[PDB]
Ligand binder design. Structure first.
Ligand SMILES: *[C@@H]1O[C@H](CO)[C@@H](O)[C@H](O)[C@H]1NC(C)=O
Length: 536
């Protein structure tokens, strides 16, 4: 050093880092990108828990994003921004265990509350370097210290021969925990306060967050939690040990393969062979179901998430949870016949019955009959527009809205302070059709404050809206309460309780308080539907 910027030189446990000064709309921020937190989980390390990164010599250049974890790349609509924005934006590699830090410039003298982003992508995709996860706005405008990590997805992160030593499962979750541990030890070097660490994530990221809540060794590494459109409970976020064992041996057979010998052989396969076959192991034709996800291993997860939330002590827990207006629409174009981004996707009653079997792939004939009965509008049972919207609701309710209601209910009843929302604003810049409404993941760009960038063509109301949400999120991170104590009655956001079931709408209009999160419909999914499949 000598002629470099004094604010960009930081030491952490493993060594020295040089960051980059980035431009945010209202001023500069500090960014430390591609900091390694684990030994590269390659070769013999594939499928194994991450080993902490051994110290390096010299000043590590931390000015660009690092590799994206090896994964399937979406190809449904080549060139289309609505799909591309989620696609990897750096080289794919198994050497991908890096994290990123954004802080104010110059970095704060007093310790700042830390926000840790965990991305979604169904546990088969995702990356902390996507444009919608850009922490520079939260860091600049709200003065937050923001951290995001890469964690292994797909087989690399989740293939499991439960019980075995060499592929124990949930190692993608262990990548996340390692980064949480890195934050406890090192974030103070950046002005972050390790005693104020808020986790937030969306979809599989939300479910990830939910699992750190449920896994005791993670609990001491954070203080509050936001779960956007995702939960550890529910039908897609976990598989049983038996089912993970089944999928893992099938996948092994498909690429050419005693647990030790199986895994040893899997380790000799190129990463791309594994990705090519990962979608061939699902039990049924389905949507919103993924091959390699967290397993109920009796270790990281001591029991099913359903069980752990029913019987858990959440006294000292503040939690913000919510959903978007149309949780189910996104995946309809991915495997329900009749649906497409290129038309209105008006469907027949026949396509609707078939859709229900794909969207509730684990339902018996009788349970699917129940779903169809509940969601049919018997005044117009053949109306194509209703049926299209009902198909979307079935998928969204079953996968997100009802797991979230279930989760919010159990947490509130068991000590937790819960705040709940529904996000209803459709980005003026959205490229998916109008019929898809506000699909899942399209609140994110607002929370991270992308509309503050003039070159992005968000409306002025959207720029103001984004700031409202950044305030809610960071107030929550700071205090456990999304409301601003200064600005009183504008109006208030009440906690969600089992008595009143209050939640707020998030849109361009001021906060509106509503009651019951699909209460009737969620009774169907959460109370009745299990008892039906518990007697078929
Ligand atoms: C933003 O604004 C200009 C004018 O409409 C347009 O040419 C450009 O493509 C827009 N960028 C985005 C993000 O679509």
């Amino acid at each position: 050093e000598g002629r470099e910027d004094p604010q960009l030189l930081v030491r952490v446990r493993g060594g020295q880092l040089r960051g980059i000064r980035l431009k945010a709309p209202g001023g500069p921020v500090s960014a430390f990108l591609g900091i390694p937190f684990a030994e590269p989980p390659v070769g013999s390390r594939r499928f194994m828990p991450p080993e902490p990164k051994r110290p390096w010599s010299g000043v590590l250049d931390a000015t660009t994003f690092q590799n994206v974890c090896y994964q399937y790349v979406d190809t449904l609509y080549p060139g289309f921004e609505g799909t591309e924005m989620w696609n990897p934006n750096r080289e794919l590699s198994e050497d991908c265990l890096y994290l990123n830090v954004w802080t104010p410039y110059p970095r704060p003298a007093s310790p700042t509350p830390v926000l840790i982003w965990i991305y979604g992508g169904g546990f088969y995709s995702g990356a902390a370097s996507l444009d919608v996860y850009d922490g520079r706005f939260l860091a600049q405008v709200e003065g937050a210290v923001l951290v995001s990590m890469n964690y292994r997805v797909g087989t690399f992160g989740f293939l499991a021969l439960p019980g075995s030593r060499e592929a124990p499962g949930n190692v993608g979750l262990l990548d996340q925990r390692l980064a949480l541990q890195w934050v406890q030890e090192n974030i103070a070097a950046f002005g972050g306060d390790p005693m104020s660490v808020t986790l937030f994530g969306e979809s599989a990221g939300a479910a990830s967050v939910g699992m750190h809540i449920l896994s005791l060794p993670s609990r001491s590494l954070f203080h509050r939690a936001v779960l956007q459109s995702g939960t550890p409970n529910g039908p897609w976020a976990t598989v049983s040990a038996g089912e993970a064992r089944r999928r893992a041996t099938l996948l092994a057979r498909l690429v050419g393969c005693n647990d030790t010998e199986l895994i040893a052989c899997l380790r000799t396969r190129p990463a791309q062979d594994l990705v090519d076959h990962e979608w061939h192991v699902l039990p049924q034709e389905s949507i919103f179901r993924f091959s390699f996800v967290p397993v109920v291993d009796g270790d990281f997860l001591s029991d099913t998430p359903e069980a752990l939330i029913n019987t858990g002590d959440f006294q000292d827990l503040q939690v913000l949870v919510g959903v978007v207006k149309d949780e189910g629409s996104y995946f309809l174009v991915y495997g329900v016949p009749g649906f497409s981004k290129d038309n209105e996707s008006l469907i027949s009653r026949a396509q609707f019955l078939a859709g229900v079997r794909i969207g509730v792939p684990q339902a018996s004939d009788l349970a699917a009959e129940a779903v169809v009965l509940h969601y049919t509008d018997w005044l117009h049972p053949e109306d194509p527009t209703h049926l299209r919207d009902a198909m979307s609701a079935v998928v969204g309710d079953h996968n997100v809205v009802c797991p979230v209601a279930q989760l919010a209910g159990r947490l509130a009843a068991q000590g937790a302070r819960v705040y709940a929302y529904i996000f209803e604003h459709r980005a003026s810049t959205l490229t998916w059709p109008l019929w898809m409404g506000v699909p899942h993941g399209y609140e994110i760009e607002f929370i991270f404050g992308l509309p503050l960038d003039p070159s992005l063509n968000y409306t002025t109301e959207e720029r103001i809206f984004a700031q409202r949400l950044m305030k809610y999120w960071t107030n929550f991170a700071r205090t456990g309460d999304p409301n601003d104590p200064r600005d009183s009655k504008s109006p208030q956001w009440p906690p969600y309780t089992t008595a009143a079931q209050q939640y707020v709408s998030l849109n361009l209009k001021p906060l509106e308080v509503r009651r019951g999160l699909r209460a009737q419909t969620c009774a169907f999914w959460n109370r009745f539907l299990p008892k039906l499949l518990s007697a078929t």
